[PDB]
């Protein structure tokens, strides 16, 4: 919150518009992280059987 507010004070309404891309892409990273753990579980199950 302090970061986005300070960004608006410095670069105006352009930093907030641009920084929204990184903010909006974070939930995409969450999906990748949650599916990465699922893939790790599959390998762990197969490796434990091996």
């Amino acid at each position: 919150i302090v970061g986005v507010i300070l960004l608006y004070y410095i670069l105006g309404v352009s930093a907030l518009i641009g920084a929204a891309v990184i903010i909006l892409l974070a939930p995409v990273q969450y999906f990748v992280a949650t599916k990465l753990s699922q893939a790790q579980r599959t390998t762990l199950e197969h490796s434990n059987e091996r």
Binding site: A33, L36, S37, Q40, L44, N48
Partner: protein, 356 residues
């Protein structure tokens, strides 16, 4: 961010047992503590001591017993700080009286010819060290100036007095901080005159011999009394087997501190089986005495463990009678050589006399 732990898996693992590595360093350390060190530096943890109050005399005593380079730094700092502190207040008085103000012949300054702080530093140096050049000197009708001059002289006298006292006691006492007494690293138990004797060698590395050398030997053992008493470090004093039964020893050439292990001696049951390192059988030999040159009593304790005691060994003879004087080969001082000797127990040795 730049760390491998962006997301922690925390997954369980199945690793079978593998404990012992190639290096035996895990179990290599097995040393057992001793209440007296080989170099005579006894170390016993005096834990949970009642908080005796500290006094400024301890700090003053620490100044007296400091080292030589440290004493120079302390006194140089003391002298320099004393001059600097008084130079600062000298500058204040001149400033507060208008002496530091631009030229005016009407007023008489509290200190004549004082212009800047550099002159104030020089004036304080002249007053405290009593050089007194006289270009800058005190004047009258300035009672504060007279008062500080008295204060500076009184302070300077006390500071100089401390320096002389510290220097005077340093030369007297610090000269007696050297321990030139060497024992043997390993003691022996030999067979002299038929009776077993515990022997060790002590020598003097200083030409001036120790006057009235007294030797005290004590066996330290956690001897639980049969009645029920238990004591962790009971000390049993051991006789000396001297020519008169006393504790006087003459130290010119190193000699063997031989004690005949008899029924009175607690070492009557000494055996090579109980000679291992982890056995509670330790000997303490203390040679007190006064050095002739200075007159300060000196003590040099040494501790011998069972593992440090070599059963059935003989000390190498040292003093060779040359044509004019006696030669001492200190290289072979504490070297012990084997000799065919009975290896039974002194308690069991009483049967040999009974059988014969």
């Amino acid at each position: 961010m730049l760390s491998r732990k962006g997301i922690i898996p925390e997954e369980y693992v199945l690793t079978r047992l593998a404990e012992d590595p190639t290096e035996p360093r895990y179990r290599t350390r097995e040393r057992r503590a001793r209440f007296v060190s080989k170099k005579g530096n006894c170390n016993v943890a005096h834990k949970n001591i009642r908080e005796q109050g500290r006094f400024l005399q301890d700090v003053f005593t620490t100044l007296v017993d400091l080292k030589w380079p440290h004493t120079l730094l302390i006194f140089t700092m003391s002298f320099l700080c004393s001059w600097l502190l008084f130079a600062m207040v000298w500058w204040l008085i001149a400033f507060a009286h208008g002496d530091l103000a631009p030229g005016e012949g009407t007023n008489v300054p509290c200190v004549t010819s004082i212009h800047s702080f550099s002159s104030a530093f020089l004036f304080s140096i002249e007053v405290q060290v009593t050089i007194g050049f006289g270009g800058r000197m005190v004047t009258e009708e300035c009672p504060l100036a007279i008062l500080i001059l008295i204060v500076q002289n009184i302070v300077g006298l006390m500071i100089n007095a401390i320096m002389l006292g510290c220097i005077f006691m340093k030369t007297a006492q610090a000269h007696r901080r050297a321990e030139t007494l060497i024992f043997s690293k390993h003691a022996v138990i030999t067979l002299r005159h038929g009776r077993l004797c515990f022997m060790l060698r002590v020598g003097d590395l200083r030409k001036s011999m120790i006057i009235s050398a007294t030797i005290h030997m004590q066996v330290v053992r956690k001897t639980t009394s049969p009645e029920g008493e238990v004591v962790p470090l009971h000390q049993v004093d051991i006789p000396m087997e001297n020519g008169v039964g006393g504790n006087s020893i003459f130290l010119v050439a190193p000699l063997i501190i031989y004690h005949v292990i008899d029924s009175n001696s607690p070492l009557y049951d000494l055996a090579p089986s109980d000679l291992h390192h982890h056995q509670d059988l330790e000997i303490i030999v203390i040679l007190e005495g006064v050095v002739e040159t200075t007159g300060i009593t000196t003590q040099a304790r040494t501790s011998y463990l069972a593992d440090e005691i070599l059963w059935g060994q003989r000390f190498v003879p040292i003093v060779a009678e040359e044509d004019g004087r006696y030669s001492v080969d200190y290289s072979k001082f504490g070297n012990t050589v084997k000799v065919p000797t009975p290896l039974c127990t002194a308690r069991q040795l009483d049967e040999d006399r009974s059988l014969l």
